[PDB]
Amino acid sequence: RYTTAFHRPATKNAAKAPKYPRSLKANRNKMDEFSIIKFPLATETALKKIEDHNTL
RNA sequence: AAUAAAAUAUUACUUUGGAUAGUUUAGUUUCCUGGGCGAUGAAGAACGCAAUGAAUUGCGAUAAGUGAUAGGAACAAUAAAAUGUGAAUAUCCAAAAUUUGAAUGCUUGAAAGUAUACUAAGGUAUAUAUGAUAUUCAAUAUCCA
């Protein structure tokens, strides 16, 4: 057979096929554009940047 | 010999101190009933959430609270809004339940992360040992054409 090492033979490997769902959590993303952004910073430092540097 | 400034003694009032008396939403002991946690993720820890909260209490991205069922007119420190078309309040119910923790894909120091499969982002499953079933294999180990 020209080699010495004996290894574990490769057999069939089916994928996971559960008979019932593992979770019933609602498919709702709890991180959207309304939850990511809380509110703009409204301090004098933040108001200077919006004018000159064109940044919010 | 003399002085009563100091010193000493008594009482009244005031002061520093918190004894004494009155009191208890706290304890101690005994007895009765139960002794009802967790991979369907427990106990513990961490972080966050109130219009004004630092702790504490209650809660989990549906946040000092949601639905439902009872309940009958309040809360209050200050404003607001809602409210008999139902406010408080109660619950072995329903939905929901962040990061961890036996902690269980891999890693974890105070570590930020990250691989594959299924249904860009999200959500599921994948630790170790183990029982039954199914399937694929290994060894001439026993026969055997």
- CA A52 – CA A45 distance, rounded (Å): 12
Q: How far is the CA of A5 from the C1' of B55 (A)?
A: 68
- CA A41 – CA A45 distance, rounded (Å): 9
- CA A16 – CA A22 distance, rounded (Å): 12
Resolution given for this structure, in angstroms = 3.0
Q: How far is the CA of A28 from the C1' of B95 (A)?
A: 15
Q: A23 beta carbon < 7 A from strand B?
A: yes
Q: A27 beta carbon < 7 A from strand B?
A: yes
- CA A37 – CA A31 distance, rounded (Å): 10
Q: How was this structure determined?
A: cryo-EM
- Nearest nucleotide from residue A30 CA, by C1' atom: B61
A48 contacts A41 by C-beta, under 8 angstroms: no
Q: Pick left, alpha or beta for residue A39 (phi over 0 → left; psi -120 to 50 → alpha; otherwise beta).
A: beta
